[PDB]
Motif scaffolding. Structure first.
Motif, PDB file in Angstrom:
ATOM      1  N   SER A   1      59.641 -41.133 144.098  1.00 49.33           N
ATOM      2  CA  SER A   1      60.418 -40.110 144.308  1.00 49.33           C
ATOM      3  C   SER A   1      61.644 -39.950 143.517  1.00 49.33           C
ATOM      4  CB  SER A   1      60.731 -39.707 145.845  1.00 49.33           C
ATOM      5  OG  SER A   1      61.396 -40.767 146.503  1.00 49.33           O
ATOM      6  N   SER A   2      62.493 -38.938 143.343  1.00 50.15           N
ATOM      7  CA  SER A   2      63.594 -38.928 142.390  1.00 50.15           C
ATOM      8  C   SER A   2      64.407 -38.015 142.851  1.00 50.15           C
ATOM      9  CB  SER A   2      63.204 -38.692 141.003  1.00 50.15           C
ATOM     10  OG  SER A   2      62.333 -39.808 140.551  1.00 50.15           O
ATOM     11  N   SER A   3      65.600 -38.071 142.670  1.00 48.13           N
ATOM     12  CA  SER A   3      66.946 -37.340 143.233  1.00 48.13           C
ATOM     13  C   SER A   3      67.854 -36.655 142.470  1.00 48.13           C
ATOM     14  CB  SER A   3      67.556 -37.999 144.440  1.00 48.13           C
ATOM     15  OG  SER A   3      66.722 -38.225 145.601  1.00 48.13           O
TER      16      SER A   3
ATOM     17  N   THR B   1      65.193 -33.952 146.357  1.00 49.80           N
ATOM     18  CA  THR B   1      64.291 -34.884 146.218  1.00 49.80           C
ATOM     19  C   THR B   1      63.065 -34.480 145.863  1.00 49.80           C
ATOM     20  OG1 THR B   1      65.703 -36.444 147.479  1.00 49.80           O
ATOM     21  CG2 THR B   1      63.327 -37.239 146.683  1.00 49.80           C
TER      22      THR B   1
ATOM     23  N   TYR C   1      59.017 -35.988 145.400  1.00 52.21           N
ATOM     24  CA  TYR C   1      58.162 -36.840 145.727  1.00 52.21           C
ATOM     25  C   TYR C   1      56.641 -36.662 145.249  1.00 52.21           C
ATOM     26  CZ  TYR C   1      56.528 -34.527 149.831  1.00 52.21           C
ATOM     27  OH  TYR C   1      56.053 -33.591 150.676  1.00 52.21           O
ATOM     28  N   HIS C   2      55.748 -37.740 145.017  1.00 56.26           N
ATOM     29  CA  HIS C   2      54.573 -37.876 144.702  1.00 56.26           C
ATOM     30  C   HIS C   2      53.919 -38.905 145.418  1.00 56.26           C
ATOM     31  CE1 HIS C   2      50.821 -38.621 142.314  1.00 56.26           C
ATOM     32  NE2 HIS C   2      50.708 -37.268 142.125  1.00 56.26           N
ATOM     33  N   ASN C   3      53.063 -38.721 146.242  1.00 55.34           N
ATOM     34  CA  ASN C   3      52.359 -39.736 146.958  1.00 55.34           C
ATOM     35  C   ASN C   3      50.970 -40.186 146.517  1.00 55.34           C
ATOM     36  OD1 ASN C   3      54.469 -40.303 148.673  1.00 55.34           O
ATOM     37  ND2 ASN C   3      53.946 -38.896 150.025  1.00 55.34           N
TER      38      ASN C   3
ATOM     39  N   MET D   1      52.173 -34.398 147.611  1.00 61.08           N
ATOM     40  CA  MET D   1      53.232 -34.382 146.880  1.00 61.08           C
ATOM     41  C   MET D   1      54.338 -33.165 147.348  1.00 61.08           C
ATOM     42  SD  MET D   1      51.733 -32.612 143.446  1.00 61.08           S
ATOM     43  CE  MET D   1      50.067 -33.107 143.680  1.00 61.08           C
TER      44      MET D   1
ATOM     45  N   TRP E   1      58.883 -31.800 147.821  1.00 57.38           N
ATOM     46  CA  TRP E   1      60.255 -31.975 147.533  1.00 57.38           C
ATOM     47  C   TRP E   1      60.957 -31.353 148.983  1.00 57.38           C
ATOM     48  CZ3 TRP E   1      57.250 -29.257 143.979  1.00 57.38           C
ATOM     49  CH2 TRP E   1      56.975 -27.785 144.130  1.00 57.38           C
TER      50      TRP E   1
END
Length: 232
Positions: A2-4, A35, A37-39, A44, A46
């Motif tokens: 994940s990234s923000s 944020t 995210y990709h699990n 996936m 946000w």
């Protein structure tokens, strides 16, 4: 993963796709956060917080295939593809939003005259295919309601000014009611625009097919459980 930060990207599927934070309103909205995210390739999404009641789009966090104001196109995306070549562009999405405020969920398809799009190449056309409308509304004028791909769509036609003498046509298809899944062929939509309406030249190239949520205001999240775009 994940990234923000604004502009952060998370690549998946051998870099064929990325999730893009795509934040426009960071300097406009105090206390914003968002944020991506990709699990896994079936989990996936946000999560966002846009405490605003202004009617501007604050962000369009999206999954991208192909070009997005980049030099070129994601690897193995199959873009660009010329409309006259009549390739099928089959997409699948299943998603679920939990949010308040004002937002939508839409495919975003970018077209150019060039097949060598650069990071600053303004598109000639944008097509939006809205699977969710929550208190929002499209740019342009209503034209008609049409049945395509097994769904009914309100069709709008307008123009987006990008400033500095740049901009593009925008064609919006808004599902007459919200849905959480659609398996579409983008070629049905481009052929409607080109053949049925004669609004779009078949000389143009599809540069990108994306899926995201425009957020105008509010707080929430999306989870995406199925995603693919295949050009063949």
């Amino acid at each position: 993963a994940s990234s923000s930060n604004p502009s952060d990207k998370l690549y998946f599927k051998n870099k064929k796709y990325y999730i893009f934070n795509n934040v426009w309103g960071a300097d406009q909205v105090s206390g914003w956060w968002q944020t991506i995210y990709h699990n896994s390739d079936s989990d996936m999404g946000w999560v966002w917080n846009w405490p605003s009641n202004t009617s501007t789009v604050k962000a369009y966090p999206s999954i991208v295939s192909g070009w997005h104001w980049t030099e070129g196109y994601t690897a193995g995306s199959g873009f660009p593809t010329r409309l006259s070549d009549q390739k099928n562009i089959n997409t699948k999405v299943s998603y679920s939003i939990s949010a308040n405020g004002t937002y939508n969920a839409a495919y975003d398809i970018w077209l150019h005259n060039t097949n060598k799009a650069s990071w600053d190449s303004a598109p000639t056309d944008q097509i939006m295919i809205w699977l969710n409308n929550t208190n929002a509304g499209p740019a342009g004028s209503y034209v008609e309601t049409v049945s395509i791909g097994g769904h009914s769509w309100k069709v709008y036609k307008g123009y987006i000014d990008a400033g500095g003498g740049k901009g593009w046509n925008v064609f919006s298809f808004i599902r007459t009611a919200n849905t959480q899944s659609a398996n579409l062929n983008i070629r049905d939509f481009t052929n409607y625009l080109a053949d049925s309406k004669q609004w779009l030249s078949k000389t143009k190239y599809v540069s990108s097919v994306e899926f995201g949520t425009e957020v105008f205001g509010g707080t929430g999240q999306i989870n995406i459980s199925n995603w693919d775009v295949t050009v063949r």
